[PDB]
A paper describes a structure:
Point mutations in the polymerase basic protein 2 (PB2) of the heterotrimeric viral polymerase and their structural consequences have been linked to host-species specificity and virulence factors in humans. In this communication, we introduce the Protein Maker and describe its use in purifying five C-terminal domain subunits of the polymerase basic protein 2 (PB2) from two different subtypes of influenza virus.
Since pigs can be co-infected with multiple zoonotic influenza A virus subtypes, H3N2 in swine has the potential to emerge in a more virulent form with transmissibility into human populations through genetic reassortment. In one run of the Protein Maker, five channels were used to purify five different CPB2 constructs in parallel with other pipeline proteins using our standard SSGCID protocol (see §2). All five constructs were successfully purified from cell lysates (see §2), generating highly pure protein for crystallization testing using sparse-matrix screens. Three of the five purified CPB2 proteins yielded crystals (not shown) and a 1.3 Å resolution structure was generated from one of them by X-ray diffraction. Despite the high sequence identity (>95%) across all constructs, including three previously crystallized CPB2 proteins, only one (InvaB.07055.c.D17) of the five tested led to rapid growth of crystals that diffracted to sufficiently high resolution for structure solution and refinement. Thus, we eliminated the 80% chance of failure (or the fivefold increase in bench time) associated with serial processing of five targets for one successful outcome via parallel purification on the Protein Maker.
Author numbering:
A (entry chain A), B (entry chain A): 541 to 678, 685 to 738
Write the structure that this text describes.
Amino acid sequence: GPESVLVNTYQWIIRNWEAVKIQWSQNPAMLYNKMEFEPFQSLVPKAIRSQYSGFVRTLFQQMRDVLGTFDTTQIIKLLPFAAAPPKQSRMQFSSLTVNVRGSGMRILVRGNSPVFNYNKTTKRLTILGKDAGTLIEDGVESAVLRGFLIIGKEDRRYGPALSINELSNLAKGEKANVLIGQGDVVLVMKRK
Amino acid sequence: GPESVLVNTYQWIIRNWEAVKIQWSQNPAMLYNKMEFEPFQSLVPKAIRSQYSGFVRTLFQQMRDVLGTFDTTQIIKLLPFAAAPPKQSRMQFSSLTVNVRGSGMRILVRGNSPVFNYNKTTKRLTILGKDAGTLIEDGVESAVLRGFLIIGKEDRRYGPALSINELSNLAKGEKANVLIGQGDVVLVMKRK
Protein backbone atom coordinates (compact mmCIF):
# COMPACT_ATOMS: atom_id res chain seq x y z
CA GLY A 1 0.00 0.00 0.00
CA PRO A 2 0.95 3.70 0.26
CA GLU A 3 3.11 3.09 3.38
CA SER A 4 4.98 0.34 1.52
CA VAL A 5 5.56 2.72 -1.40
CA LEU A 6 7.17 5.29 0.86
CA VAL A 7 9.38 2.76 2.68
CA ASN A 8 10.29 1.03 -0.60
CA THR A 9 11.23 4.28 -2.35
CA TYR A 10 13.68 5.26 0.39
CA GLN A 11 15.01 1.70 0.58
CA TRP A 12 15.68 1.82 -3.16
CA ILE A 13 17.56 5.12 -2.94
CA ILE A 14 19.73 3.71 -0.14
CA ARG A 15 20.38 0.41 -1.99
CA ASN A 16 21.48 2.36 -5.08
CA TRP A 17 23.10 5.28 -3.31
CA GLU A 18 26.48 4.73 -4.97
CA ALA A 19 25.06 5.36 -8.44
CA VAL A 20 22.43 7.89 -7.31
CA LYS A 21 24.97 10.11 -5.53
CA ILE A 22 27.14 10.40 -8.65
CA GLN A 23 24.15 11.09 -10.90
CA TRP A 24 22.86 13.74 -8.48
CA SER A 25 26.15 15.62 -9.01
CA GLN A 26 26.76 14.90 -12.70
CA ASN A 27 23.37 14.55 -14.44
CA PRO A 28 20.62 15.40 -11.97
CA ALA A 29 17.88 15.94 -14.58
CA MET A 30 18.35 12.35 -15.74
CA LEU A 31 18.13 11.19 -12.12
CA TYR A 32 14.95 13.18 -11.43
CA ASN A 33 13.25 11.69 -14.46
CA LYS A 34 13.81 8.02 -13.46
CA MET A 35 10.72 5.81 -13.61
CA GLU A 36 11.46 4.44 -10.14
CA PHE A 37 10.06 7.66 -8.54
CA GLU A 38 6.58 7.34 -10.10
CA PRO A 39 4.99 5.35 -7.23
CA PHE A 40 6.12 8.01 -4.73
CA GLN A 41 4.81 10.78 -7.00
CA SER A 42 1.33 9.17 -6.91
CA LEU A 43 1.32 9.96 -3.18
CA VAL A 44 2.01 13.69 -3.62
CA PRO A 45 -1.06 15.93 -4.14
CA LYS A 46 -1.49 16.68 -7.86
CA ALA A 47 -2.16 20.37 -7.24
CA ILE A 48 1.24 20.95 -5.63
CA ARG A 49 3.72 18.33 -6.81
CA SER A 50 5.17 20.52 -9.61
CA GLN A 51 5.79 23.36 -7.16
CA TYR A 52 7.36 20.93 -4.66
CA SER A 53 9.63 19.78 -7.48
CA GLY A 54 10.71 23.25 -8.52
CA PHE A 55 11.45 23.98 -4.83
CA VAL A 56 13.50 20.85 -4.25
CA ARG A 57 15.39 21.10 -7.55
CA THR A 58 16.38 24.66 -6.59
CA LEU A 59 17.46 23.56 -3.10
CA PHE A 60 19.60 20.84 -4.63
CA GLN A 61 21.34 23.32 -6.92
CA GLN A 62 22.10 25.51 -3.88
CA MET A 63 23.77 22.50 -2.30
CA ARG A 64 25.85 21.84 -5.44
CA ASP A 65 26.90 25.49 -5.52
CA VAL A 66 27.86 26.08 -1.89
CA LEU A 67 31.03 24.26 -0.97
CA GLY A 68 31.03 21.91 1.98
CA THR A 69 27.24 21.74 2.41
CA PHE A 70 26.60 18.28 0.89
CA ASP A 71 24.10 16.46 3.12
CA THR A 72 23.34 12.84 2.28
CA THR A 73 20.28 12.66 4.54
CA GLN A 74 18.75 15.78 3.02
CA ILE A 75 19.31 14.63 -0.56
CA ILE A 76 17.78 11.23 0.12
CA LYS A 77 14.80 12.77 1.96
CA LEU A 78 13.91 15.25 -0.76
CA LEU A 79 14.91 13.38 -3.89
CA PRO A 80 11.54 11.73 -4.73
CA PHE A 81 9.87 15.18 -4.67
CA ALA A 82 12.13 16.31 -7.56
CA ALA A 83 10.47 13.79 -9.89
CA ALA A 84 7.53 15.96 -11.09
CA PRO A 85 7.80 18.44 -13.99
CA PRO A 86 9.00 21.48 -12.07
CA LYS A 87 7.27 24.84 -11.74
CA GLN A 88 8.79 27.81 -9.93
CA SER A 89 7.18 29.81 -7.12
CA ARG A 90 8.23 32.23 -4.38
CA MET A 91 6.95 30.12 -1.50
CA GLN A 92 8.99 28.55 1.27
CA PHE A 93 7.70 25.07 2.17
CA SER A 94 8.49 23.87 5.71
CA SER A 95 7.00 20.44 5.04
CA LEU A 96 5.89 18.34 2.07
CA THR A 97 2.70 16.25 1.91
CA VAL A 98 2.55 12.56 1.16
CA ASN A 99 -0.78 10.67 1.18
CA VAL A 100 -0.26 7.64 3.42
CA ARG A 101 -2.24 5.80 6.12
CA GLY A 102 -5.42 7.43 4.78
CA SER A 103 -4.25 10.99 5.49
CA GLY A 104 -1.86 13.70 4.29
CA MET A 105 1.28 13.25 6.42
CA ARG A 106 3.98 15.90 6.21
CA ILE A 107 7.72 15.33 5.77
CA LEU A 108 9.60 18.19 7.49
CA VAL A 109 12.08 19.83 5.11
CA ARG A 110 14.56 20.49 7.95
CA GLY A 111 15.59 17.54 10.13
CA ASN A 112 13.57 14.59 11.34
CA SER A 113 9.84 13.92 11.43
CA PRO A 114 7.58 10.96 12.20
CA VAL A 115 7.59 10.09 8.47
CA PHE A 116 11.37 10.50 7.91
CA ASN A 117 13.63 9.83 10.90
CA TYR A 118 17.38 9.49 10.40
CA ASN A 119 19.12 8.25 13.49
CA LYS A 120 22.51 9.86 13.85
CA THR A 121 23.42 7.32 16.58
CA THR A 122 22.58 4.07 14.75
CA LYS A 123 23.12 5.59 11.24
CA ARG A 124 19.89 4.02 9.98
CA LEU A 125 16.89 5.61 8.34
CA THR A 126 13.43 4.89 9.74
CA ILE A 127 10.38 5.58 7.59
CA LEU A 128 6.98 5.55 9.33
CA GLY A 129 8.55 3.55 12.18
CA LYS A 130 10.11 0.88 9.92
CA ASP A 131 13.73 0.34 8.85
CA ALA A 132 14.82 1.61 5.44
CA GLY A 133 18.55 0.82 5.80
CA THR A 134 21.91 2.32 6.70
CA LEU A 135 23.07 5.67 5.30
CA ILE A 136 26.63 5.87 4.00
CA GLU A 137 27.98 9.39 4.56
CA ASP A 138 30.35 11.20 2.19
CA GLY A 139 27.58 24.04 9.54
CA VAL A 140 25.78 25.84 6.71
CA GLU A 141 22.43 24.39 5.58
CA SER A 142 21.95 25.00 1.86
CA ALA A 143 18.88 22.87 1.10
CA VAL A 144 16.20 24.15 3.47
CA LEU A 145 15.14 27.64 2.29
CA ARG A 146 15.01 28.73 -1.35
CA GLY A 147 17.39 31.66 -1.86
CA PHE A 148 18.85 31.47 1.67
CA LEU A 149 21.53 29.72 3.67
CA ILE A 150 21.05 28.82 7.30
CA ILE A 151 24.38 29.98 8.75
CA GLY A 152 24.26 29.34 12.50
CA LYS A 153 22.64 30.20 15.80
CA GLU A 154 20.49 33.24 16.53
CA ASP A 155 22.32 36.59 16.65
CA ARG A 156 20.40 39.39 18.40
CA ARG A 157 22.27 41.92 16.24
CA TYR A 158 19.86 41.07 13.40
CA GLY A 159 16.59 41.83 15.17
CA PRO A 160 13.21 40.15 15.75
CA ALA A 161 12.78 36.63 14.42
CA LEU A 162 10.85 36.30 11.20
CA SER A 163 8.74 33.39 10.04
CA ILE A 164 9.78 31.69 6.80
CA ASN A 165 7.03 33.53 4.91
CA GLU A 166 8.37 36.92 6.06
CA LEU A 167 11.69 36.85 4.17
CA SER A 168 10.81 37.99 0.63
CA ASN A 169 11.82 41.65 0.99
CA LEU A 170 15.18 41.03 2.67
CA ALA A 171 18.11 42.36 0.62
CA LYS A 172 20.72 40.20 -1.10
CA GLY A 173 23.36 39.40 1.53
CA GLU A 174 21.14 40.46 4.43
CA LYS A 175 21.13 38.35 7.59
CA ALA A 176 18.02 37.74 9.70
CA ASN A 177 16.84 35.57 12.55
CA VAL A 178 14.25 33.01 11.53
CA LEU A 179 11.87 30.88 13.56
CA ILE A 180 12.65 27.68 11.68
CA GLY A 181 10.65 25.40 14.05
CA GLN A 182 9.23 25.34 17.60
CA GLY A 183 11.72 27.03 19.96
CA ASP A 184 14.46 27.00 17.32
CA VAL A 185 15.60 30.36 15.99
CA VAL A 186 18.44 30.30 13.47
CA LEU A 187 20.45 32.94 11.63
CA VAL A 188 19.97 32.97 7.85
CA MET A 189 21.51 34.92 5.00
CA LYS A 190 19.79 35.83 1.74
CA ARG A 191 22.12 34.67 -0.98
CA LYS A 192 23.75 37.20 -3.28
CA GLY B 1 4.80 49.25 28.53
CA PRO B 2 4.31 47.21 25.33
CA GLU B 3 1.42 45.19 26.86
CA SER B 4 -0.30 48.45 27.83
CA VAL B 5 0.14 49.73 24.26
CA LEU B 6 -1.61 46.69 22.83
CA VAL B 7 -4.49 46.78 25.34
CA ASN B 8 -4.84 50.57 24.97
CA THR B 9 -4.90 50.46 21.16
CA TYR B 10 -7.77 47.96 21.11
CA GLN B 11 -9.57 49.85 23.89
CA TRP B 12 -9.32 53.01 21.79
CA ILE B 13 -10.75 51.34 18.69
CA ILE B 14 -13.68 50.02 20.73
CA ARG B 15 -14.31 53.39 22.45
CA ASN B 16 -14.39 55.11 19.05
CA TRP B 17 -15.98 52.30 17.08
CA GLU B 18 -18.92 54.42 15.94
CA ALA B 19 -16.66 56.82 14.04
CA VAL B 20 -14.06 54.19 13.08
CA LYS B 21 -16.63 51.87 11.50
CA ILE B 22 -17.96 54.62 9.22
CA GLN B 23 -14.46 55.76 8.24
CA TRP B 24 -13.43 52.16 7.50
CA SER B 25 -16.23 52.05 4.89
CA GLN B 26 -16.04 55.60 3.54
CA ASN B 27 -12.42 56.81 3.78
CA PRO B 28 -10.24 53.92 4.91
CA ALA B 29 -6.91 55.47 3.82
CA MET B 30 -7.57 58.40 6.16
CA LEU B 31 -8.36 55.94 8.97
CA TYR B 32 -5.19 53.89 8.38
CA ASN B 33 -3.05 57.00 8.54
CA LYS B 34 -4.30 58.16 11.98
CA MET B 35 -1.58 59.04 14.49
CA GLU B 36 -3.28 56.94 17.17
CA PHE B 37 -1.89 53.73 15.57
CA GLU B 38 1.79 54.75 15.88
CA PRO B 39 2.39 53.17 19.33
CA PHE B 40 1.06 49.82 18.06
CA GLN B 41 3.23 50.09 14.93
CA SER B 42 6.34 50.41 17.14
CA LEU B 43 5.59 46.85 18.30
CA VAL B 44 5.51 45.35 14.79
CA PRO B 45 8.89 44.21 13.37
CA LYS B 46 10.27 46.88 11.02
CA ALA B 47 11.25 44.33 8.38
CA ILE B 48 7.68 43.12 7.89
CA ARG B 49 5.23 45.82 8.93
CA SER B 50 4.77 47.21 5.38
CA GLN B 51 3.98 43.74 4.04
CA TYR B 52 1.56 43.13 6.95
CA SER B 53 -0.12 46.40 6.01
CA GLY B 54 -0.47 45.58 2.33
CA PHE B 55 -1.94 42.20 3.35
CA VAL B 56 -4.47 43.63 5.79
CA ARG B 57 -5.48 46.52 3.52
CA THR B 58 -6.19 43.97 0.76
CA LEU B 59 -8.19 41.76 3.14
CA PHE B 60 -10.25 44.76 4.18
CA GLN B 61 -11.07 45.61 0.57
CA GLN B 62 -12.22 42.00 0.04
CA MET B 63 -14.60 42.47 2.95
CA ARG B 64 -15.95 45.74 1.48
CA ASP B 65 -16.47 44.02 -1.87
CA VAL B 66 -18.16 40.79 -0.81
CA LEU B 67 -21.67 41.39 0.42
CA GLY B 68 -22.67 40.15 3.84
CA THR B 69 -19.14 39.38 5.09
CA PHE B 70 -18.62 42.39 7.40
CA ASP B 71 -16.98 41.14 10.60
CA THR B 72 -16.53 43.66 13.41
CA THR B 73 -14.13 41.45 15.38
CA GLN B 74 -11.89 40.88 12.37
CA ILE B 75 -11.74 44.57 11.46
CA ILE B 76 -10.88 45.59 15.01
CA LYS B 77 -8.23 42.83 15.31
CA LEU B 78 -6.41 43.70 12.10
CA LEU B 79 -6.89 47.45 11.90
CA PRO B 80 -3.66 48.57 13.67
CA PHE B 81 -1.62 46.49 11.19
CA ALA B 82 -2.97 48.62 8.29
CA ALA B 83 -1.15 51.68 9.66
CA ALA B 84 2.24 51.17 7.94
CA PRO B 85 2.98 52.33 4.37
CA PRO B 86 1.78 49.27 2.48
CA LYS B 87 3.81 47.00 0.22
CA GLN B 88 2.31 44.12 -1.75
CA SER B 89 3.47 40.49 -1.67
CA ARG B 90 2.14 37.06 -2.61
CA MET B 91 2.42 35.58 0.87
CA GLN B 92 -0.39 34.35 3.07
CA PHE B 93 0.18 35.26 6.73
CA SER B 94 -1.57 33.01 9.29
CA SER B 95 -0.43 35.19 12.19
CA LEU B 96 1.06 38.63 12.76
CA THR B 97 3.89 39.45 15.18
CA VAL B 98 3.73 42.00 17.96
CA ASN B 99 6.68 42.54 20.33
CA VAL B 100 5.26 42.33 23.84
CA ARG B 101 6.30 40.76 27.18
CA GLY B 102 9.89 40.61 25.90
CA SER B 103 9.06 38.29 22.98
CA GLY B 104 7.40 38.19 19.56
CA MET B 105 3.82 37.06 20.24
CA ARG B 106 1.61 36.19 17.29
CA ILE B 107 -1.96 37.35 16.67
CA LEU B 108 -3.80 34.66 14.67
CA VAL B 109 -5.42 36.12 11.55
CA ARG B 110 -8.38 33.71 11.81
CA GLY B 111 -10.28 33.56 15.11
CA ASN B 112 -9.00 33.84 18.66
CA SER B 113 -5.51 33.62 20.13
CA PRO B 114 -3.91 34.23 23.53
CA VAL B 115 -3.16 37.82 22.43
CA PHE B 116 -6.62 38.58 20.93
CA ASN B 117 -9.58 36.72 22.42
CA TYR B 118 -13.12 37.81 21.59
CA ASN B 119 -15.68 36.09 23.74
CA LYS B 120 -18.82 35.39 21.77
CA THR B 121 -20.67 34.56 25.02
CA THR B 122 -19.86 37.70 27.06
CA LYS B 123 -19.37 39.91 23.94
CA ARG B 124 -16.16 41.37 25.40
CA LEU B 125 -12.67 41.52 23.95
CA THR B 126 -9.77 40.26 26.05
CA ILE B 127 -6.24 41.31 25.13
CA LEU B 128 -3.38 39.41 26.80
CA GLY B 129 -5.81 38.28 29.51
CA LYS B 130 -7.14 41.79 30.29
CA ASP B 131 -10.45 43.44 29.37
CA ALA B 132 -10.53 45.79 26.38
CA GLY B 133 -14.31 46.39 26.35
CA THR B 134 -17.57 45.29 24.74
CA LEU B 135 -17.92 44.86 20.97
CA ILE B 136 -21.01 46.31 19.34
CA GLU B 137 -21.98 44.17 16.34
CA ASP B 138 -23.48 45.52 13.11
CA GLY B 139 -20.83 32.22 6.56
CA VAL B 140 -18.20 33.41 4.09
CA GLU B 141 -14.90 34.68 5.53
CA SER B 142 -13.49 37.43 3.31
CA ALA B 143 -10.63 38.79 5.44
CA VAL B 144 -8.44 35.76 6.16
CA LEU B 145 -6.68 34.78 2.89
CA ARG B 146 -5.55 37.25 0.23
CA GLY B 147 -7.34 36.45 -3.04
CA PHE B 148 -9.60 33.77 -1.50
CA LEU B 149 -12.88 33.37 0.33
CA ILE B 150 -13.39 30.73 2.98
CA ILE B 151 -16.78 29.34 1.93
CA GLY B 152 -17.63 26.51 4.34
CA LYS B 153 -16.72 23.07 5.61
CA GLU B 154 -14.42 20.58 3.90
CA ASP B 155 -15.77 18.95 0.73
CA ARG B 156 -13.96 15.76 -0.32
CA ARG B 157 -14.92 16.49 -3.94
CA TYR B 158 -12.05 19.00 -4.05
CA GLY B 159 -9.22 16.69 -3.06
CA PRO B 160 -6.32 16.63 -0.58
CA ALA B 161 -6.05 19.54 1.83
CA LEU B 162 -3.48 22.17 0.98
CA SER B 163 -1.57 24.40 3.36
CA ILE B 164 -2.04 28.15 2.95
CA ASN B 165 1.30 28.41 1.13
CA GLU B 166 0.19 25.84 -1.47
CA LEU B 167 -2.58 27.90 -3.12
CA SER B 168 -0.75 30.16 -5.60
CA ASN B 169 -1.33 28.06 -8.73
CA LEU B 170 -5.04 27.42 -8.18
CA ALA B 171 -7.21 28.83 -10.98
CA LYS B 172 -9.61 31.76 -10.62
CA GLY B 173 -12.87 30.31 -9.27
CA GLU B 174 -11.26 27.03 -8.23
CA LYS B 175 -12.28 25.48 -4.91
CA ALA B 176 -9.85 23.62 -2.63
CA ASN B 177 -9.67 22.21 0.86
CA VAL B 178 -7.27 24.07 3.11
CA LEU B 179 -5.73 23.18 6.46
CA ILE B 180 -6.46 26.54 8.05
CA GLY B 181 -5.39 25.49 11.58
CA GLN B 182 -4.86 22.35 13.71
CA GLY B 183 -7.59 19.81 12.85
CA ASP B 184 -9.62 22.40 10.95
CA VAL B 185 -9.97 21.90 7.21
CA VAL B 186 -12.12 24.42 5.36
CA LEU B 187 -13.27 24.84 1.78
CA VAL B 188 -11.93 27.94 0.01
CA MET B 189 -12.49 29.51 -3.38
CA LYS B 190 -9.95 31.55 -5.34
CA ARG B 191 -11.71 34.75 -6.24
CA LYS B 192 -12.41 35.57 -9.87
